[PDB]
UniProtKB/Swiss-Prot annotation, chain A:
Main location, first listed in the record: cytoplasm
Keyword check for Translocase: no
Entry similarity comment: Belongs to the universal ribosomal protein uL2 family.
Superkingdom of the source species: Eukaryota
Positions of post-translational Phosphoserine modification: S51, S94, S158, S159
Additional note from the record: There are 2 genes for uL2 in yeast.
Protein source organism: Saccharomyces cerevisiae (strain ATCC 204508 / S288c) (Baker's yeast)
An annotated Gene Ontology molecular function: structural constituent of ribosome
Protein name (record): Large ribosomal subunit protein uL2A
Pfam families attached to this UniProt entry: Ribosomal_L2, Ribosomal_L2_C
GO cellular component: cytosol; cytosolic large ribosomal subunit
Keyword Cell inner membrane: no
Function of the protein: Component of the ribosome, a large ribonucleoprotein complex responsible for the synthesis of proteins in the cell. The small ribosomal subunit (SSU) binds messenger RNAs (mRNAs) and translates the encoded message by selecting cognate aminoacyl-transfer RNA (tRNA) molecules. The large subunit (LSU) contains the ribosomal catalytic site termed the peptidyl transferase center (PTC), which catalyzes the formation of peptide bonds, thereby polymerizing the amino acids delivered by tRNAs into a polypeptide chain.
Curated annotation (Swiss-Prot), chain B:
Alphabetic keyword roster: Cell cycle, Nucleus, Phosphoprotein, Protein transport, Ribosome biogenesis, Transport
Highest taxon in the source lineage: Eukaryota
Quaternary structure annotation from Swiss-Prot or TrEMBL: Associated with the 60S pre-ribosomal particles. Interacts with NAP1.
Family per record: Belongs to the SDA1 family.
Span covered, complete protein: 6 to 515 of 767
Note: Present with 3640 molecules/cell in log phase SD medium.
A cellular component annotation (GO) from this entry: nucleus
GO biological process, one term: protein transport
Physiological role: Required for 60S pre-ribosomal subunits export to the cytoplasm. May also be required for 60S ribosomal subunit maturation and accumulation. Involved in G1 events and passage through start, and possibly actin cytoskeleton organization.
Keyword Glycosyltransferase part of the UniProt annotation: no
Name the UniProt record assigns to this protein: Protein SDA1
Length: 245, 431
RNA sequence: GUUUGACCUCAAAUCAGGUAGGAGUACCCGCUGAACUUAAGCAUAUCAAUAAGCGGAGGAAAAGAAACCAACCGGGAUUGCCUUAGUAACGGCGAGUGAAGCGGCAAAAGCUCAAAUUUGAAAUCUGGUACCUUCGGUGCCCGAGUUGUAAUUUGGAGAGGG
RNA sequence: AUGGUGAACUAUGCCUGAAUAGGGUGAAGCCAGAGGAAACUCUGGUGGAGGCUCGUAGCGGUUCUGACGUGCAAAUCGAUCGUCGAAUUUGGGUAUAGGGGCGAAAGACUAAUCGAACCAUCUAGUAGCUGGUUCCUGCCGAAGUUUCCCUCAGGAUAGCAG
RNA sequence: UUCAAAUGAGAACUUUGAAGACUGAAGUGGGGAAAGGUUCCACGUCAACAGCAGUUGGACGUGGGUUAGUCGAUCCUAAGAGAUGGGGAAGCUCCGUUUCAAAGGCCUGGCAGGCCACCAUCGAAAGGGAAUCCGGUUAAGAUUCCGGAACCUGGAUAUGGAUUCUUCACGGUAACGUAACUGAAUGUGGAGACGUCGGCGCGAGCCCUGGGAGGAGUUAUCUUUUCUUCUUAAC
RNA sequence: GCUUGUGACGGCCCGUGAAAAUCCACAGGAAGGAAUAGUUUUCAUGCCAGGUCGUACUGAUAACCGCAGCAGGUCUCCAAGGUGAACAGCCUCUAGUUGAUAGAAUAAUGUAGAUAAGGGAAGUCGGCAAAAUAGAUCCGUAACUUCGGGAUAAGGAUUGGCUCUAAGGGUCGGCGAUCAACUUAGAACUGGUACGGACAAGGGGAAUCUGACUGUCUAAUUAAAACAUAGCAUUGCGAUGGUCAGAAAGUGAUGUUGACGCAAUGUGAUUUCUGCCCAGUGCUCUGAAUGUCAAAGUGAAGAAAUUCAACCAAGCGCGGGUAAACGGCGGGAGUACUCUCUUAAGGUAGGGAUUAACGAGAUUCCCACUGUCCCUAUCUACUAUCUAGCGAAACCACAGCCAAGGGAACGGGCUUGGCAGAAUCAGCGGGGAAAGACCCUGUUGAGCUUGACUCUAGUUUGACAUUGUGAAGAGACAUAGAGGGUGUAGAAUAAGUGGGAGCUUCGGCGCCAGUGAAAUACCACUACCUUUAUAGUUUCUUUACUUAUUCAAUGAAGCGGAGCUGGAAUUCAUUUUCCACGUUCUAGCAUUCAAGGUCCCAUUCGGGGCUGAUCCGGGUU
RNA sequence: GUGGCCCCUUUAGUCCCUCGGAAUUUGAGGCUAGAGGAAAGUUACCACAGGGUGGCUUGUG
RNA sequence: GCGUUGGAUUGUUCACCCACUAAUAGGGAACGUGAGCUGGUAGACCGUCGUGAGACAGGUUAGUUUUACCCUACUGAU
């Protein structure tokens, strides 16, 4: 048989991301003495757009303490920040939107974004548009902190891990229909080559497990296993269930 | 996914089984719903009547409770608090209503109790008191005659679940405290003379076959069943002692008195005429196979057979094959002579057919293989007449009798039949 | 003495002087490694411990002076030829595969380290430099080296003491 | 099978650049007037939206008992037709290499080669069946179930002749 | 397509002239990129080729011809390619492009004290980019040569000018202005540097057109007539 | 007015539309500089130099690629006048070309066009093809409709030329003077067979099936109801990760990513509909014990090789979930059969179905129109034809008149007959030329599929090694022990079997007495069941440490502990915890070993130290 | 009158042979005598090599 | 000997229908394998079957052979 599309996706010839017009990798400030003990102030200069991304970014300028110079970080903007705003980042920072704090300092019930799975990760969770995590409780002994993620899962992580207050901007982006193939074309033009998607049923047997037949059908049971391997995993990888909910 | 997670239980339980210190509020959010649901369930095509249902569509409340019961039964071990009364709620949901619950919910609770007993949350001593009372209630004849009562299916489910329970309990070592307790309920069911010992016999046979209840205490139960008045209980006992018999005969307390009581109660005593022929024959088989094996003496058997020993009678080849099985070396051969002379008068007489004569001779020679001095030389010769009979049934039959008496009493045979070694043995031993 | 030095380890130089690469590759030393074919079709098998591919040398290479063959009245490094032998043996015991000792011959060749206290004298060696009779010698000066350079000894023997 | 060469055509992605008359319809926003208590409505204008439309260049390639058929041409010529401001057309640079790539998916395209490219070697590969097999004369001279290996079957044999 | 003449042994096909037509500014024109490589131009010149012909030719034989501080490459980086250090791999070689390196360049005053922080290289003759225009000239070369007139970079530098005894300028309320009017480390900002369509405005060139000064053509009748020249570069 | 450049604006985006080199300015103020004279080369002038390579020509119906001087293909700039909406079509100016084998005739058949009386689809599988319509102004425009369209719907009145009228503007003057363009409406007259006079340029309508649409593909026979599409639904994944690569790697794509995301599938706009089954096959479950149960490891026998037994992970088996998973289509009860009754895929209403637009998609009918046809005729151009020059190809056993016969149903050759006169030109397509599919077979070649066979990458679970330092518990081997038995009756809870009528502390008692299949004292046998202890033997679970190992980050910057210091803080006498001297109205600034204080030297135009800024540490975090 | 009318499994060897440097004991191999008895489909997307009238009838069951 | 038609019907025609007509007769030379011109493999969909690749009880749709210039015959011409 042939090698199939998902197997070809791993080499990364024509499936690499399209990264020319991206403003830069969005990240939090590196964990330093200031963020660990007190706070530090920066100025948000520009609220800007990032190609291939629905959420906007913010350019935040901070003052290097060890040398006389300026350092520009690229944050993911939360809903409500504005140019000329002061962003306070650290342990002793106040509880306002856009500020960066550790999860142990804040109380439970608060809303944060761009959370680090571990301290020094510089942003892992709640980065897409309209997304947020909710702190539900702390455990100061054994220092840990329990959070709820956008998928609904509940996790426990270090209280020294950081996050930025508020909701990521750009919400509602998926409530608008596209109505046209051209808008999907231009959307994925800047993300990657995962569009259009031909159906495996419409191919020959060399090209897919689902291919073949005088009628467009699958010969079996679209729930594949998890111990399957590299050419068998067509659809519904490890389905605990199927059907409408 | 977050808003749908409360609706998706299969993902919730896999998440809870990982980190159950989290997902406390997610569990309370469902336990409250389960409580509010059980608090509810606690309490035709004609032109006139309301339309009926197909039997497979259900309510959205029941479809939710059936899911919540499984979720709570699978995470009770993670949340021992807030679930301590859950199995008692299930138990008093079952054995106080029995009827305001749909069959799917009943089945779900019955399986959740079984897995809650597989895990050591619940004990067998309190699961038995849930399972047994439902059998008698769904074998009621008044509960099983609704519109869509699933009484037969429930009676099968509870039965196989009891079997799984006892198989579970008797794996490592035999839980005598449990077996001795649930044999007492079989005894106390067989007392109730209507039909309720069915669920004792049908269960003890299964456990004997699975080898879980090899004990002297159990064979007494089936003895009492065989000595019962109900036909479908007596038959269960008889077919147990049959299954050629099984090792249970070697755990009886008095086989002779057992056979005597059987022959007196069922067949001869009152002549109630309850059993049909197909059951009378199975009783005869048991009696004769006990008798021949254990050297018993009743002497009424051998006149009871004579009514039925006629070729114009229904399925006589089974009766006469049990006639021989009640013969010995140690019984008065006159009461068997009358039997042999009935058979000879009615099966190898004038004009009879080939199959009839062959059946007669074949069932006489296998009598004489146990009771050799039960027919005399004068009729022995009359029957070895039929050696060269041209029919190939009677010849094969007569040769068997000749070879039987060639090794046992060859002087009854004539010189023509003593085959080269019986005659030589007689010639040396006659001088 | 929070100073001044010795050693050890690791580096740097367009430092002084040399060295490797690549080609050819008939033969040679290894590594890696197929299928066509033949077996009935074919997984064992055969083609084959082959072809292709990789690394590495020389005028020859490799091997080589027994941890050998033997069971004899004992032979006596290695290599090659005649023969042993299409044999012993291996194998769907099929297709097929398949050596070795002995004997005759060609050519002939033996040896070296470590392990031993010079301990009454590191006796050893590279380089730099000045002369010379320059494929090298003598002197002198930095250095290597005792965590062992020379002489002496290699199992056939051999050493020390007399 | 082994080892190698190809994205100058063509498939797809990326980078950097370029090209695309004249008309028809007339969306949001806006101006005035009339009717209103006011929600708002009606009329006349403005404006110039659209993976709209007619239709050039351009891109494609529907139909013709079309021309040609050793043709201008190893796919062309004519007329007719689809589309024509965008999922558009295109140059150069770049990436993906063979049981691999790419594919808006026809098993399509991958240098006139694709249900597995091209080059060389293993290789005088091989079944099966076909075709052919080179001077004269003389003498002798046939054969077609007779018996069988898992039925065809390629065979092994009886008999015939030298 | 035609007529005459010339050339020549020979002219339907060459040259000139006289006619008639065609492409009809989305050209049968004038220039370029890729590719080609002297095919360009001249002098001789017909054996073969130009599916007839041939005195002709992109043919044959021999020569000539391509001039740059300003046009380009060169430089920069784009997608991307690719060494080193290190790590794999029997190995031909693979990974990856700042990595887990002691990766080098500045100051002050038997070398002593300080400061800086960072990755080879390649990759566009349509992207970015310092600076030249006119006229004339050749058989064939030109934004390259000739004449004339300018500009950019880099370097050494003298004079004048400006400033200064209130040492590193004044004016203007201000927006800001001027011939200038010191400035190391370090830091910051800007330019380079950017989509597409719609209509509106402004400019250049072209189109159309009038009077006048010249030349040509028609004139059988008419037409103060039809056509044409009257231009102004970089800086 | 055309082309082009430019400016300020507006609209569009789940699209917001390169980087670097290079240049400048600003902040800052190290520093150096005038007085009897300096400073400034960002003002003006003046001086010197600028290397290497390319540079001709074509850029195409003859300079490139197609075997070629091939009607094919191949990127781009400039672009005049008229008609006309127009870079359309037609004619012309500048510039260029006049190249493509010629001459004579005008037969048929052809190729490319054109016209035709009356009838108008009688033709034909089929109105194929052709014809007809066509531009602009005005009137008018149905069903249906996703209310946006359908729609140029349809169907009708007109169009020339000439002479006029009216209206539509700008600049200056305290309504006039002056200047200028083409836009429309209207009237009169006039020629006509024709007036969008050539060119140019929709045929329309009533319905059906189908896919929503725009778009894409089989280069070189299939452009479509196929693919894609937006929309719809499902699944996996919270980074120690999901999906996918790589021989390996201190290796990679998604990923400059983070659930409004990535990956994997199916369906295929909107509207309407969307009922039930987890028996089966798949998928899944942090699913007990028992069963099956590999290697290592353990025990027994033996002189040993070996043999046996026990233990034995995952997986299987077992039982729970799931159908916008493949399947599939009823349920229950009473005695597979047989009787019974519920069937909730019920139309919610008798307004339940009258249902767009788009399409080189498949189909029928009507109007109009015609040489499709009756029924053919005529004309034009290039060929054919003849001539000068040039000059192939296919095919070819030998050849070439017919009939009958034999014959493989079938002769040009043989037999018997009919006949038979040179050499030839133009035509024709009957035969010969003379060069197909379909069917079958190989014990074939390849492609594809599957619980066909043998294998395998990958993945998964177990053992060993890497692998070191501590502790606490549970189970088992193995011995030593200790006790036990309710179906009923019987005084009583009878393993069972065999001997029988006392050893006697008591003569309690055992025998003789019921009842029971079996009879109990007393003493032996050998079955099961349950518990007590650990010489030892082992196995297993949990937990601690860090230096191996592993992961990530950085500028390897602030780590760990301190009567630290100073504050409070609440204590039950002395602590324990918080803080720390550092920063939160504001789109500013923060840099020269850091000023100051303090000790010493030198008096210099300034140097050095402590402190400002707590101490220690063999761990960068 | 010496009867009747038609090839891969396993066991055992007195004092059987061998295990090739000698022996003993286990095992193994022989020769005897006994007892038993590897593998499924599809191809129209395809490719290759080969092969392929007896004068017959008529209108009447 | 001479004539033996024109048309309708493809949810089909191994045929039938109504008209005109003097009449609207039957057949062969092909169909005793296969031979002018015209209707009646590759792509795609629905149905039946198949675990599946695919096949079919089907049905619908779209879908490139191209002489004669040679001999003979025939027709006309020397």
């Amino acid at each position: 048989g042939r090698v199939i599309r998902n197997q070809r996706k791993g080499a990364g010839s024509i499936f690499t991301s399209h990264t020319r017009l991206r403003q830069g990798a969005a990240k939090l400030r590196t964990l330093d003495y200031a963020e660990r003990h007190g706070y530090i102030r920066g100025i948000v200069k520009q609220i800007v757009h990032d190609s291939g991304r629905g959420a906007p970014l913010a350019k935040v300028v901070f003052r290097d303490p060890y040398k006389y110079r300026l350092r520009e970080e690229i944050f993911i903007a939360n809903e409500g920040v504005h140019t000329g705003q002061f962003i306070y980042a650290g342990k002793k920072a106040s509880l306002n939107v856009g500020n960066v704090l550790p999860l142990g300092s804040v109380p439970e019930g608060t809303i944060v974004s761009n959370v680090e799975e571990k301290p020094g990760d510089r942003g892992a969770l709640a980065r897409a548009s309209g997304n947020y995590v909710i702190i539900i409780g702390h455990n100061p002994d054994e220092n840990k902190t329990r959070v709820r993620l956008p998928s609904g899962a509940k996790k426990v992580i270090s209280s020294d891990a950081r996050g930025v207050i508020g909701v990521i901007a750009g919400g509602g982006r998926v409530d608008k229909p596209l109505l046209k193939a051209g808008r999907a074309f231009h959307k994925y033009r800047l993300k990657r080559n995962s569009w259009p998607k031909t159906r495996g049923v419409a191919m020959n047997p060399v090209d897919h497990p689902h291919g073949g037949g005088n009628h467009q059908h699958i010969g079996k049971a679209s729930t594949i296993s998890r111990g399957a391997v590299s050419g068998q995993k067509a659809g519904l990888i490890a389905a605990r269930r199927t059907g409408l909910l | 996914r977050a808003a749908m997670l409360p609706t998706n239980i299969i993902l919730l339980q896999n998440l809870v089984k990982r980190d159950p210190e989290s997902y406390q509020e997610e569990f309370l959010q469902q336990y409250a719903h389960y409580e509010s649901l059980r608090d509810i369930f606690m309490l035709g095509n004609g032109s006139s009547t309301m339309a009926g249902t197909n039997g497979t569509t259900m309510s959205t409340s029941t479809s939710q409770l059936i899911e919540l019961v499984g979720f709570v039964s699978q995470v009770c071990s993670c949340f021992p608090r807030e679930t301590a009364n859950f199995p008692s709620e299930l138990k008093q949901l079952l054995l106080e209503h029995h009827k305001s619950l749909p069959f799917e919910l009943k089945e779900k609770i019955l399986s959740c109790l079984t897995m809650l007993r597989n895990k050591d949350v619940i004990t067998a001593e309190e699961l038995i008191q849930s399972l047994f009372p439902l059998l008698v209630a769904y074998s009621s004849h008044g509960n099983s005659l609704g519109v869509n009562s699933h009484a037969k299916e429930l009676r099968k489910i509870i039965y196989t679940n009891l079997i799984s329970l006892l198989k579970s309990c008797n794996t490592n070592g035999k839980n005598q405290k449990l077996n001795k307790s649930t044999q007492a309920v079989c005894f106390n069911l067989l007392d109730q003379p209507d039909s309720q010992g069915i669920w004792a016999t049908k269960l003890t046979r299964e456990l004997w076959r699975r080898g879980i209840w090899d004990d002297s205490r159990t064979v007494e139960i089936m003895t009492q069943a065989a000595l019962h008045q109900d036909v479908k209980i007596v038959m269960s006992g008889v077919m147990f002692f049959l299954d050629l018999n099984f090792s249970a005969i070697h755990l009886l307390r008095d086989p002779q008195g057992f056979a005597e009581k059987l022959f007196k109660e069922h067949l001869s005593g009152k002549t109630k005429n309850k059993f049909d022929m197909e059951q009378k024959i199975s009783l005869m088989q048991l009696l004769s196979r006990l008798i021949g094996t254990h050297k018993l003496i009743v002497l009424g058997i051998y006149t009871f057979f004579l009514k039925y020993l006629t070729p114009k009678q229904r399925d006589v080849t089974r009766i006469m094959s049990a006639c021989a099985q009640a013969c010995h070396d140690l019984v008065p051969p006159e009461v068997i002579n009358v039997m042999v002379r009935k058979i000879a008068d009615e099966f190898v007489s004038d004009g009879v057919a080939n199959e009839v004569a062959a059946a007669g001779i074949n069932t006489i020679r296998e009598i004489c293989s146990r009771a050799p001095l039960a027919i005399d030389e004068i009729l022995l010769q009359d029957l070895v007449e039929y050696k060269g009979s041209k029919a190939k049934g009677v010849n094969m039959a007569a040769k068997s009798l000749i070879a039987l008496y060639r090794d046992v009493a060859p002087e009854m045979l004539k010189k023509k039949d003593r085959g080269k070694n019986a005659a030589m043995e007689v010639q040396e031993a006659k001088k």
